[PDB]
Design a protein around this ligand. Structure first.
Ligand SMILES: *[C@@H]1O[C@H](CO)[C@@H](O)[C@H](O)[C@H]1NC(C)=O
Lengths: 49, 367, 60, 342, 49
């Protein structure tokens, strides 16, 4: 397959995807999200101490 | 300090296209071009070591070139570098050649010999020198202006860059196997010869002496010198010693790049007049030079070209002036004035063409 | 200083087992040095020791 | 710029030795069959027919990447900065700030607080590239998803980032006739073409007369919108009107006005100052501009000033230092044609 | 996780992302301590209280 799916954004949920390749052996695969790292704009403006 | 000689290794050279169609066994061949200087100086790989010798002197009369398991030498006044024009050699240092020269379909280097008969490695080599800035030149410049750029810095201290230098495949010399009545006397002559024979009693193996290979002929014998004493390099385009992986190449290769400025030609100032909501610009040319222009509002509407001759170009001007950039000079800036005159007040109306100066012919539908 | 390894001893790259002039006493062990010790930057100082004219052959 | 690097290839005479499937950026390998190694003494190997030749090729960075490289940047919101010189009663003093309503500076009793940038427009999109003297707003392919022979022919995050996303397809070939070399296939790059046809830098593509300036790149001098400034000044500057002369019987006489961009006309103010004193002149409309701001006046005479408008007839009023003059000027068609300043 | 970085592992090819919900927990004017960040209008430069 070129199996494009949309798994829910949940860390640690085993998504069981199906590969019924055409006239081929069926194949179930597991995926599991482990981190969601979001890093915003690194724009330091000024300081205060 | 000042030695490269002993990290070199004796993998040889046969120049696969030395000119006039075909090939020859030549050690002085061209392998690589480095053209990434912005100004247009040229950095060239050779399979020789220049500025330096066997015994590592700065002499310019000897240079290590490999002629059939021999270190021979050559004058560094006989350096005939030529793409279409003969090039202007500046830097001669080991692996490296630095020169400034114009456009050409091919590129060659020429060299004298120990037999003092100059030849040339001549490869079809479509190096094209780049363009930079906006200007070209007719005569040599000694009076010019500034342009930032980059060129190869002339420094010996460029470490941790290498070429592939490795133990030789062999040096198969079929002039070592003399025949003694259907035998073969492998005349090694102070070498280390690996023979590969399709005969009896001595097939494949090393020898240091003029060995007797009986019932064997020249086509039945081989004389391949395992060179491990005299060491002179090439490119890794030629094959390896094929008994293991690679002898790792370690030679620091100098002359890095750095940023400078340059005495660029300037651009001649053109002449202009104003006219009714427009401008009239005659241009003194010098050479084919680009020109650009734009206006100063919601879009620049910038139009660009190369101009070549004494060119009178007419441009209408909006209410926001005009910006014409010609050469690397000042970007010429302009603003409109209401042009000549409408009228008097008088017995007729005669303010309509007052109004054809002030908001000319726009919002005249409304009245 | 910087630790060069010819697979047997963790010697300095300034102090090889053959200080100075490696090729002037061994060609092919210098070639195995050129195969192995090239992972060390201080080996260049050994190349200033062995290769780049600091041998026994200089009268220094 | 990348660099295509080959090994010294393997001439496996009398047999075949399969290469090791290493992972290099555009690793490529082929063991050509029936090869013919050649050297100075004829053929190189005494074995002739069963000579095969392993060949390998790869591409990595070059040595120009230390100081010569372009950079696809993600641009963002812009930060403003402004420069201001005030002629503080015959004294020029200059200060830079942020033009956001948010940058207060004080020096020489001048509480300079600007108002906001009335516009909001930035001349840049996020997808921006920069090389060494210029920038270009185009959409590069992103990292990883680059295209061969373009921007993104070779992709690295930083110069120190060694993830070199390469796309060359350098397929090897059998050599010509016994030639001891490795030929490869076509691979056009991006540096070989688009640097020569990047063309009009954003200095030239700039609307409203913007200008660009590197180190760091910045959009200068497209003064669009209207900038407020609040400035507070104490009573150290203001003087009493009894320290000024009460100017009476003012009458404006314009011998020549010409509605133009430059000095639009000249005027004579018949005035009757009571004494000696320095006082202000300010027209009650913004259209006509006296070039004279603070005038020392002496008595009962005719001062002579200039003014500038594009009004076809400038009929207006001037507060001449808390006294009023009404002025009238038949202006004339402008005879000038081109002007270098707005 | 933005739909730009393809990755193949033991020939298994994946382009991940992009993120469906582009929600952001950060303000523009945010102040940073050694372990923390806070959404708070710090007073602007030169125009501070
Ligand atoms: C002061 O500034 C005005 C305009 O701001 C200028 O015309 C004048 O030449 C300046 N004078 C001095 C002394 O800087």
């Amino acid at each position: 397959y070129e199996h494009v799916t949309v798994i829910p954004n949940t860390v640690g949920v085993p998504y069981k995807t199906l590969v019924n390749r055409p006239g081929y052996s069926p194949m179930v695969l597991e995926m599991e999200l482990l981190s969601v790292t979001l890093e915003p704009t690194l724009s330091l403006d000024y300081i205060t101490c | 300090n000042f030695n490269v000689y002993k990290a070199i290794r004796p993998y040889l050279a046969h120049c696969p296209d030395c000119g006039e169609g075909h090939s020859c066994h030549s050690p002085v061949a061209l392998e690589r071009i480095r053209n990434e200087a912005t100004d247009g100086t040229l950095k060239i790989q050779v399979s020789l070591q220049i500025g330096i010798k066997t015994d590592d002197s700065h002499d310019w009369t000897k240079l290590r070139y490999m002629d059939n398991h021999m270190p021979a030498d050559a004058e560094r006044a006989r350096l005939f570098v030529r793409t279409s024009a003969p090039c202007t050699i500046t830097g001669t240092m080991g692996h490296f050649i630095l020169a400034r020269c114009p456009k050409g379909e091919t590129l060659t280097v020429g060299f004298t010999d120990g037999r003092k008969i100059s030849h040339s490695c001549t490869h079809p080599f479509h190096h094209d020198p780049p363009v930079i800035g906006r200007e070209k030149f007719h005569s040599r410049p000694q009076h010019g202006r500034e342009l930032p750029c980059s060129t190869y810095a002339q420094s010996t201290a460029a470490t941790a860059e290498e070429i592939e230098v490795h133990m030789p495949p062999d040096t198969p010399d079929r002039t070592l196997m003399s025949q003694q009545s259907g035998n073969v006397k492998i005349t090694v002559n102070s070498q280390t010869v690996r023979y590969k024979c399709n005969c009896g009693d001595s097939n494949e193996g090393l020898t240091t002496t003029d060995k007797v290979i009986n019932n064997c002929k020249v086509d039945q014998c081989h004389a391949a010198v395992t060179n491990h004493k005299k060491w002179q390099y090439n490119s890794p385009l030629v094959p390896r010693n094929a008994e293991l992986g690679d002898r790792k190449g370690k030679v620091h290769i100098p002359f890095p790049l750095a940023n400078v400025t340059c005495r660029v030609p300037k651009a001649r100032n053109p002449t202009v007049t104003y006219g009714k909501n427009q401008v009239i610009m005659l241009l003194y040319p010098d050479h084919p030079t680009l020109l650009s222009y734009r206006n100063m509002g919601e879009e620049p509407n910038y139009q660009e070209e190369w101009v070549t001759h004494k060119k009178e170009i007419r441009l209408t001007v909006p209410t926001e002036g005009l910006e014409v950039t010609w050469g690397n000079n000042e970007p010429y800036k302009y603003w409109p004035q209401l042009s000549t005159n409408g009228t008097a007040h008088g017995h007729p109306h005669e303010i309509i063409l007052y109004y054809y100066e002030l908001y000319p012919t726009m919002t005249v539908v409304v009245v | 200083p910087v630790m060069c390894l010819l697979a047997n001893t963790t010697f300095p790259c300034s102090q090889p087992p053959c200080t100075p002039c490696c090729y002037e006493k061994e060609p092919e062990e210098t070639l195995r040095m050129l195969e192995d010790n090239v992972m060390r930057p201080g080996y260049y100082q050994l190349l200033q020791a062995s290769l780049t004219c600091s041998p026994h052959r200089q009268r220094r | 710029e990348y660099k295509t690097v080959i090994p010294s290839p393997y001439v496996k005479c009398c047999g075949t030795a399969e290469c090791k499937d290493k992972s290099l950026p555009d690793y490529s390998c082929k063991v050509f069959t029936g090869v013919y190694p050649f050297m100075w003494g004829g053929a190189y190997c005494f074995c002739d027919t069963e000579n095969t030749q392993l060949s390998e090729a790869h591409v990595e960075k070059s040595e120009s990447c230390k100081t010569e490289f372009a950079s696809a940047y993600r641009a963002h919101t812009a930060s403003a900065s402004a420069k201001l010189r005030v002629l503080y009663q015959g004294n020029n003093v200059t200060v830079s700030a942020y033009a956001n309503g948010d940058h207060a500076v004080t020096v020489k009793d001048a509480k300079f607080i600007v108002g906001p940038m009335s516009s909001a427009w930035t001349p840049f999109d996020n997808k921006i590239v920069v090389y060494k003297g210029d920038v270009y707003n185009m959409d590069y392919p992103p990292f990883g998803a680059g295209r061969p022979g373009q921007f993104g022919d070779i992709q690295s995050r930083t110069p120190e980032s060694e993830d070199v996303y390469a796309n060359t397809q350098l397929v090897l070939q059998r050599p010509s006739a016994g030639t001891v070399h490795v030929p490869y296939s076509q691979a056009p790059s991006g540096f070989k073409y688009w640097l020569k046809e990047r063309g009009a830098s954003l200095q030239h593509t700039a609307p409203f007369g913007c200008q660009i300036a590197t180190n760091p790149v910045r959009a200068m001098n497209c003064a669009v919108g209207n900038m407020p400034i609040s400035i507070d000044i104490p009573d150290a500057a203001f003087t009493r009107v009894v320290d000024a002369p009460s100017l009476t019987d003012m009458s404006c006489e314009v011998p020549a006005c010409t509605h133009s961009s430059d000095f639009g006309g000249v005027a004579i103010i018949k005035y009757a100052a009571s004494k000696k004193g320095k006082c202000a002149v300010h027209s009650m409309t913004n259209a006509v501009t006296i070039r004279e701001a603070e005038i020392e006046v002496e008595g009962n005479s005719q001062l002579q000033i200039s003014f500038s408008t594009a009004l076809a007839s400038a009929e207006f009023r001037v507060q001449v230092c808390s006294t009023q003059v009404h002025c009238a000027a038949e202006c004339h068609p402008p005879k000038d044609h081109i002007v270098n300043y707005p």
